[PDB]
Amino acid sequence: HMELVFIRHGQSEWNAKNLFTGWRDVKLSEQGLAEAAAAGKKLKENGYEFDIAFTSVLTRAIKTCNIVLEESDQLFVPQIKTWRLNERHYGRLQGLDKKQTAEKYGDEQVRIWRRSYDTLPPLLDKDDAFSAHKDRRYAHLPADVVPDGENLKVTLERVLPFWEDQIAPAILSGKRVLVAAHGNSLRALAKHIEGISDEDIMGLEIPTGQPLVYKLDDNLKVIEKFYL
Amino acid sequence: HHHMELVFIRHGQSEWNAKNLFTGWRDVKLSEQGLAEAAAAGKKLKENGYEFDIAFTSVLTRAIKTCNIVLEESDQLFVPQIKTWRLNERHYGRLQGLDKKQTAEKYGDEQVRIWRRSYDTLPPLLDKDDAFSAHKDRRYAHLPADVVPDGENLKVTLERVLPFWEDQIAPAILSGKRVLVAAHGNSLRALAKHIEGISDEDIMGLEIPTGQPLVYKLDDNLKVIEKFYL
Amino acid sequence: HHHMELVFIRHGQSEWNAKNLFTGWRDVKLSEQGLAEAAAAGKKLKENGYEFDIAFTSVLTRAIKTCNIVLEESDQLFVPQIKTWRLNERHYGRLQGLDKKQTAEKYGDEQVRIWRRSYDTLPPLLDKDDAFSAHKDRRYAHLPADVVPDGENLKVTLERVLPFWEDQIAPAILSGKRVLVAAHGNSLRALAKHIEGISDEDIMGLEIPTGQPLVYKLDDNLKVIEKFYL
Amino acid sequence: HHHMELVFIRHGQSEWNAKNLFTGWRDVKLSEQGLAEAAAAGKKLKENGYEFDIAFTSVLTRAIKTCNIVLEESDQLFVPQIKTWRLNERHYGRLQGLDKKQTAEKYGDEQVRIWRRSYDTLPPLLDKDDAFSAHKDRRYAHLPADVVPDGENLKVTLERVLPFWEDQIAPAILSGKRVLVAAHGNSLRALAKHIEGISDEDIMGLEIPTGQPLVYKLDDNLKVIEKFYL
Incomplete structure (x- = not known):
């Protein structure tokens, strides 16, 4: 049996401004930085050691990852950053005020974009x-894997290969894995790991700044799930 | 070799091709004919000056051995080699190990054609x-069991081939590496569909002959400039 | 930038530097001054347009945190980061954790000077x-025990730094990657000794300032064209 | 099996052996006899139940081909393979490509004994x-030029073999991987000296037969429990 730990980053400066973020590379707020430190301290107090840490290529997640590792006395742990763990791309909604958007397109169209599993944004x-095609951190990737907008379904389709190639093989080799990422990329992993239906997944809550622990059996089936 | 070039090679005849048995993920060896095809392909790449910086292959022996022979016969067995289940042949399901003629007798030509190549229908x-x-083969022991297939068609094969293009092959080309891919009919047909932008309808007619090096000349954005067989 | 550049950054003051203690492989944190030094360096590199493709650091927290601060303050925390024991500070043996003044009182000024600055004299x-x-620190649990030292001088530090230059740093530069190395006084001094071709008799006089980016312009043979501090 | 096992295999006869030519880093092929020795060693490994998780070899064709044959004849050609210059044969300097008798004529009979029986005397x-x-060979083009030698003795061979033990081989064993190393007389001898703790005075007399699997049973600290030829 192996334990797998997820951490979602806390508040960003754009959350505080009520802006759609997606793949825009915004900074954590002071609150979000404190949340990361509190999470690392909690992992330390419960004796969680990691052999490898996976994160996105967005600064708010990487900094969360580094803070969590440092505050639990293991900043030496190897770290792999991947676009496959990025937040869902929000298309043309990125950078827009959520209130101004609801007032322009209506409360209903906005609810669809945020709460529909398979409705793409503009x-x-x-x-x-x-x-994102102009961002140097994707320069080594074929251009057509850089999205122009995603929903959770398409987000899952590009998260899943990283589970299959890196995260699950690490667990099966005996490595204690930390995944530090975003609301929708972690939600995608949870849907697969826990076998959650398309109908139910959009309602799954993943709190910010709270370590989530899975206990898995030799076939990576969930035995235990609990928040630290 | 003025442009960035990418080379594909489909392995030659296997012992089960000669016996007329569906193979899929079963790990069968090359026949003598297939071994000769690999050597002739390597000599052709040598004669035409094709140097590689990295070689990708499947984890099925017939493809790896083809890759090794091609490299040796073109004087570059030192080239680093990555083996991946994602480049395996399609899984043939329960048909693996059965006689193709007896299967056509029991089920009919048209049903056999659908199992051979479909974009919407799985084999049994x-x-x-x-x-x-394949769940019992230790070469997949580090994969979640839900990743190891019980049967595949061409669409499903493409869906597990493509991430390897996105994560490994295309970054290698974009980094300036001259890539060799030594694999199987269906996994190479899957790559070609994506590289060439071929529709779901049209990919059903794409044929890739065994043992003939296939060369793509790609531009800076990996669009096909030229495609030809050596 | 018109040429291929290699950037070194030595971490700033640690909480043990302020208190006049030998540190070695002890995993001490940066002081407030050391943290500010790292931010000022990242700002300098940002202002002068230094982009990196890969970052190398040790497994000691003060160097990793320096590396992370520098990348963040130059808008590139996404850069891949490799951490290795081979870039660790010189191991100071039994002197680790001792007060340098009280050590000099016990053993004399000259002996502490020898321990600090002799090329090939091991500490106790x-x-x-x-x-x-260090044998009890789980960050070395995946290494054979006989490579975990009980004490080092600069000569043996160079002996374990140099393979990492040969296997990782130089191949990265040769592939065209713009490299950052965030490490320690003795491990950077070791790299400098090799890159610049400094004799055993002259290297113990080479100073590497803390928190100041050091830039090598290199040619295609990794020979120093120019060395300057940012 | 019972404990953690590590397997070495020295490649068999090359085409230069019957000509009595010093080989070193020259990329000479296996003879038909050398090919048979590899197949028989793989057959022996299969019969005795030796499975591998990773295989390490040099970048010289005679060792890579030995490695591939051993894996294929034991039904495990899928095993990941890493090729490194650090496992190359000892470079023989100016003696490479020369007859051993013609060497006695140009240098004298006694001077040749030293070059083949001294731990620490470089060849011309x-x-x-x-x-x-070797500086002209594209397989070393991604490496700093000074790691390519102009000649080596066993001591210098050990100095560039040992980091690969420390970085790749021993961490693999410590992670639970069953390792195969397919290499050359002097690089395997270098590994054996370190693993077994053999002195400088005794190591030049250590014989490693060709084509004969060598098995180490190691404990959790990588101490030898048993060493035996299969």
């Missing part, structure tokens, strides 16, 4: 100044 | 506790 | 069963 | 611009 123009 | 599945299930 | 060795021996 | 070095210099 897509971002491929050569927009704030398109 | 192989029971997970069968003695020859 | 730390017993392998000591609670603060 | 090969000029870096020689037609048959």
Whole structure:
């Protein structure tokens, strides 16, 4: 039996401003930084040691990862950063005020974009100044894996290969894994690991700043799930 | 070799091709004919000056051995080699090990054509506790069991081939590496579908002959400039 | 930038530097001054347009945190990061955790100077069963025990730094990658000795300032074209 | 099996052995006899139930091909394979490509004994611009030029073999991997000296037969429990 630990990053500066973020590379707020430190201290007090840490390539998640590791006396743990763990891309909604958006397109269309499993947002123009295609951190990837907008379903389709190639093999080799990522990428992993239906997954809550522990059997089936 | 070039090679005849048995993920060896095809392909790559910086292959022996022979015969057995289940042949389900002629007799030509190549229909599945299930092969011991297939068609094969293109092959090309991919009919057809932007309808007619090096000349964005067989 | 550049950053003051203690492999934290030094360096590199493709650091927290601060303050925390024991500070043996002044009072000024600055004089060795021996730190649990030292001089530090230059740092530069190395006084001094071609007799006089980015312009043979501090 | 086992295999006869030519880093092929020795060793490993999780070899074709044959004849060609210059044969300098009798004529009979029986005496070095210099070989193009030697003795061979033990082989064993190492007389001898703790005075007399699997049973600390030829 192996334990697998997830941590979702806390508040960003754009959450505080009520802005859609997606793949925009925004900084944690002071509150979000404290949440990361509190989470690392909790893992330390319960004696959680890690052999490898997986994160996204977005600064708010990487910094959360580093804070959690440092506050639990294991900043030496190897770290792999991957676009496959990025937040869901929000298309042309990125950078927009959620209130101003609901007032422009209506409360109902906004609810769809945020709460529908397989409804894509309005897509971002491929050569927009704030398109991910212009971001150097994706330069080594074929351009067509850089999305112009995602929902949770498409987010899952690109998270899952990283579970299959890196996370699950690490667990099966005996490694104690930390995953430090985002609301929707962690929600995608949880849907797969726990076998949650399409109908139920959009309602699954993953709190920010609270370590989530899975206990898995030799076939990676969930035996225990609890928040630290 | 003025442009960035990518080379594919499909392995030659296997012992089960000669016996007319469905193979799929069963780990059968090359026939002498298939061994000769690999050597002739390596000599052709040598004669035309094809140097590689990395080689990708499946974890099925017939493809790995093809890869090794091609490298040796072109004087570059030192080239680093990555083996991945994601480049395996399609899984043939319960049909693995059966005679193709007897299967066509029992079920009819058209049903056999659908099992051979479909974008929407799976072969009959192989029971997970069968003695020859891939779940029992230690080369997949570090994969979740739900990743190890019980049967696949071309669409499902593509869906597990593509992440390897996204994570390993395409980054290698974009980094400037001259890539060799030595694999199987269906996994190479899956890559070609994505590389060439072929529709779900049209990929059903894409044929890739055994033992003939296939060269793509790609531009800076990995679009096909030219495609030809050596 | 017009040429291929290699950047070194030595971490700033630690909480043990302020208190005049030998540190070695003890995993001490940066002081407030050391943290500010790392931010100022990242700002400098940001202002001068230094982008990195890969970052190398030790497994000691003060160096990793320096590396992370520098990347964050130059808008590139996404850069891949490899941590290795081979970039650790020189192990100071039994002197680790001792006060340098009280050590000089006990053994004399010259002996502490020899321990600090002799190229090939080992410090007194730390017993392998000591609670603060590196053999008990789980970050070295995946290494054979006989590579975990009980004490080091600069000569043996170079002997274990150099393979990491040969296997990882130099191949990265040669592949075209813009490299950051965030480490310690003795491990960077070791790299400098090799890169610059400094004699055994001259290296103990080489100073590497803390928290100041050091830039090597290199040619295609990794020979120093120019060395300057940012 | 019972404990953690590590298997070495020295490649069999090369085409230069019957000509009595010093080989070193020259990339010579296995003879038909050498090919048979590899197949028989793989057959022996299969019969005795030796499964591998990872295989390490040099970047010289005769060792890589031995490694591939051993894996294939034991039904495990899928095993991941890492090729490294650090497992190359000892570089023989200016003696490479020369007859052992013709060497006695140009240097004298006693001087040849020293070059083949002294732990720490270098052979005459090969000029870096020689037609048959390793510096011209593209398999080392991704490495700093000074790791490619102009000639080596066993001591210098051990100095560049040992980091690969420390970085790759021993961490694999310590993680639970069943390791195969397919390499050369002097690089395997270097490994044996370190693993077994053999002195400088005794190691030059250590014989490693060709084509004969060598098995180490190691304990959790990588201490030898038993060493035996299969």
